Amino acid sequence: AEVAPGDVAIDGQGHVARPLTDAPGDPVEGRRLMTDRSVGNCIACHEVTEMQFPGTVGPSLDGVAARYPEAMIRGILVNSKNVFPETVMPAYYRVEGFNRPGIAFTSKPIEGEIRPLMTAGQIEDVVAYLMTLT
């Protein structure tokens, strides 16, 4: 059972208090997804020294679990803009409202349903990994 994009309970600060799925997050897979250029591609913008050639557009995620609550970290992943208005960080659990979305990098328009950049489970896996960053 996973909470579908349209249904996430989102407080006023952009925090999301409950996991997006009832499956436990696997931090090992979380780690892989973040460096998977095909999925999270998070290292394009973020350094994590625990984990080459990280970008500097976003802050270092070293320590993120020591400074932000789990609910805030999850909120950042569901729709970063709810947490950081007008951020350049992508919204990984959004499926509506894009201008000219394409099928990955094929330049073809998405016709029919738009799937989120990551699934609920991929997000909880990533959250689980970030929570090890104390």
Partner: protein
């Protein structure tokens, strides 16, 4: 380094840092060539045409310039003279309003108009190698001249359309050109050092793909890489975006063909 001088062949001064154009002054303390964001080793490759692999294609286009092609038996040179004279200055002022068209046109559109209507020759594919080598030759003979594209008058509505596109978020990653090149220039995306995304050095010879890269080819790839659907090369949208992005670099010198990552 970022603040080091670029001279080409020991002869051609390139302005690589300039005061921000009035239309953009709110956003940058100064405008900068993409050259200023490259490592010293890559910067050196643009300082001597002998080291600039882009200039091999330019030398080929210099021969093409003199070669009759098409049913009319003419070469560019038969109407325009020596390329160093007949194309002098042109790169610095396109895209521009063209009297015969009642529209803003790009250099590529002009070239294909002569190929078809004056030469009886096949159009060159807009971002293909033949076109891009000829646009690089045209750029090369104006190196060191300030980019000076008009943004008002009959070009205003086109410039405004391009400005709109520049700041529109596209793709499932939901990013505009400004997201990266204005907000985060001088930062890194993975190993790439973000520049201001200027086009005064186009067509660029990219060390990554070892070929010349047309402006609209770069633009197409940038929107693609937001996980988005680019506009067509040669489209009104990318003609507009090119005029606008060219104007973000007004005052920087023509540099093409430049060497970039």
């Amino acid at each position: 380094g970022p603040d080091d001088p670029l001279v080409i062949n020991g002869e051609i001064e390139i302005v690589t840092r300039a005061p921000t154009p009035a239309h953009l002054a709110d956003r940058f303390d100064e405008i900068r060539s993409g050259w200023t964001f490259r490592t010293d080793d890559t910067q050196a490759l643009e300082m001597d045409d002998f080291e600039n692999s882009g200039m091999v294609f330019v030398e080929e286009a210099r021969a093409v310039w003199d070669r009759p092609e098409g049913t009319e038996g003419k070469a560019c040179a038969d109407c325009h003279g020596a390329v160093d004279d007949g194309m002098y200055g042109l790169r610095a002022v396109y895209p521009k309003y063209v009297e015969s068209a009642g529209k803003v046109r790009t250099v590529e559109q002009m070239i294909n108009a002569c190929r078809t209507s004056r030469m009886g020759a096949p159009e060159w594919d807009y971002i293909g190698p033949d076109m891009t080598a000829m646009v690089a030759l045209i750029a090369s003979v104006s190196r060191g001249m300030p980019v000076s594209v008009a943004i008002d008058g009959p070009a205003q509505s086109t410039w405004e359309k391009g400005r709109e596109i520049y700041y529109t978020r596209y793709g499932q990653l939901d990013l505009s050109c400004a997201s990266c090149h204005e907000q985060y220039f001088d930062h890194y995306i993975r190993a790439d050092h973000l520049s201001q995304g200027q086009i005064n050095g186009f067509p660029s010879y990219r060390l990554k793909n070892a070929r010349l890269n047309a402006v609209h080819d770069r633009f197409r790839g940038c929107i693609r890489d937001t996980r988005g659907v680019p506009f067509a090369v040669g489209s009104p949208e990318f003609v507009a975006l090119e005029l606008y992005v060219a104007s973000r670099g007004n005052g920087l010198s023509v540099e093409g063909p430049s060497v970039r990552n």
